[PDB]
């Protein structure tokens, strides 16, 4: 209840941590630990009736975010773990079910079968990109194919539970919490050309409500970097 980091404070009341391991620290990489370790609340998305899903590429949603974004232009390298708090707040008269899954190395697929998607289309900075429940056509050149039953990666979307995940059932549950360690092949990588995590929120059972209730429900994502450090002097 009412946890705080730096100059921010959020409140909480069930956590699922990564692949079982907890994030920790390692020329010489220096340790900045107090200046940017805080809760970065992104803006809320609206869960409507015929909504399809959302995604965020994770070391890119915190690129225009304050002093964390200032520490990226000053540093060529870095390695960072995360802690993600997702909560949506509806009444007891709404009903639905969300899957909050955190995918490492999620290559997206382009709509044209020869090309590859562009950086403006793969990831909106600190802004959610949307799945669709129709097909993106082949005629446009560089756009992400977002048929949500394939999850944009050419796979069964029901089998996405092999990644570290959490269900949000409005009947019983209210929030989700993930703690994701640093997963990469190299120990310290180029932070400008690599988005090594992807946070997806997909409504399996759609939102429903009776006439009179509030016709859409907000979802609030909060990311807090754990064990961030960069390389330089």
């Amino acid at each position: 209840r009412s946890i705080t980091l730096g100059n921010s404070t959020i409140t909480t009341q069930n956590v699922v941590v990564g692949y079982g391991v907890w994030p920790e620290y390692l020329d010489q990489p220096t340790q900045p630990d107090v200046a940017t370790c805080r809760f970065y609340t992104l803006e809320s998305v609206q869960w409507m009736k015929n909504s399809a899903g959302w995604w965020w590429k994770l070391p890119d949603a915190l690129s225009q975010m304050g002093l964390f974004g200032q520490n990226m232009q000053y540093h060529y390298l870095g390695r960072t773990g995360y802690t993600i708090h997702v909560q949506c707040n509806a009444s007891k008269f709404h009903q639905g079910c969300l899957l909050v899954v955190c995918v490492p190395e999620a290559e997206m697929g382009c709509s044209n079968l020869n090309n590859t998607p562009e950086f403006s289309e793969l990831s909106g900075g600190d802004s959610a990109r949307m799945f669709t429940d129709t097909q993106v056509g082949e005629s446009n050149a560089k756009k992400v194919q977002t048929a949500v039953w394939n999850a944009g990666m050419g796979v069964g979307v029901g089998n996405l539970t092999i990644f570290p995940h959490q269900w949000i059932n409005l009947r019983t549950n209210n929030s989700a919490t993930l703690v994701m360690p640093y997963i990469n092949s190299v120990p310290m990588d180029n932070m400008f050309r690599h988005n090594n995590l992807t946070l997806m929120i997909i409504p399996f059972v759609p939102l429903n409500y009776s006439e009179g209730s509030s016709p859409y429900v907000p979802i609030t994502v909060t990311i807090a970097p754990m064990c961030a450090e960069y390389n330089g002097l």
């Binding site: 007891k92 079910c97 069964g156 539970t161 009947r171 360690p181 120990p187 399996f204 059972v205 009776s210």
Partner: protein, 219 residues
């Protein structure tokens, strides 16, 4: 020199051997290891996780997220079937493309038990009851709620808990996992009555596979 004598099957290439081989690049000083999280030592750890079962195919929901949702509504006749699916393997069943059933298509003989978890994603104010019938191999599919009750079953009160587990065995009539309305869905005013159920499947941790082959999911 030392007298040797070469036997049959000497200068042959058997593709399934294990022999020492001369290294093309010695003196390279290979890159050391690194602790990356999430190591897989066996394929049965991939099968032990829960995955959503597309139990609502119906030829127009397969290109949707509606394939995973079982429709539940408050009708007027007491005693009806919600869903039902056989446990016959391979012949286009519903546990086929799931994350368990993708490993068991790489082998020819496998035999064990299955967890089946159901989750009621309806309102918090809706109540009701369900029967969860399992017919063993040899016994027919039940055609009433009554003779479904006379077999093995679980009565699932939705208002108490929102998740019910049912464990069956699955070996390479072979079974049925039908489910029935015991009572209707009682709902207050200003609450919707059309609710859905999701179904998860897993491996019940204790089984084995033999004789690896290649998957039928390719051109």
């Amino acid at each position: 020199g030392l007298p040797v004598m070469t036997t049959p099957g000497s200068t042959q290439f058997l593709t399934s051997d294990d022999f020492q081989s001369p290294s093309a690049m010695p003196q390279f000083d290979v890159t050391p290891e690194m602790q990356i999280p999430g190591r897989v030592n066996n394929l049965m750890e991939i099968a032990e996780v829960d995955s959503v079962v597309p139990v609502n195919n119906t030829e127009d929901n397969v290109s949707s997220l509606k394939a995973y949702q079982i429709p539940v509504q408050s009708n007027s006749d007491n005693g009806k079937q919600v869903f039902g699916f056989p446990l016959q393997p391979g012949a286009n069943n519903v546990l086929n493309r799931t994350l368990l059933g993708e490993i068991l298509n790489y082998y020819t003989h496998w035999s064990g038990s299955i967890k089946l978890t159901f989750m009621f994603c309806g309102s918090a104010m809706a109540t009701g009851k369900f029967l969860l019938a399992y017919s063993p191999p040899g016994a027919g599919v039940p055609k009433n709620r009554k003779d479904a009750m006379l077999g093995t079953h679980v009565i699932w009160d939705v208002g108490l808990q929102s998740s019910c587990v049912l464990c069956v065995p699955w070996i390479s009539a072979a079974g049925y996992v039908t489910c029935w309305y015991q009572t209707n869905i009682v709902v207050p005013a200003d609450v919707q009555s059309s609710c859905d159920i999701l179904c998860f499947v897993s491996a019940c941790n204790d089984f084995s596979v033999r004789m690896l082959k290649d998957t039928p999911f390719i051109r």
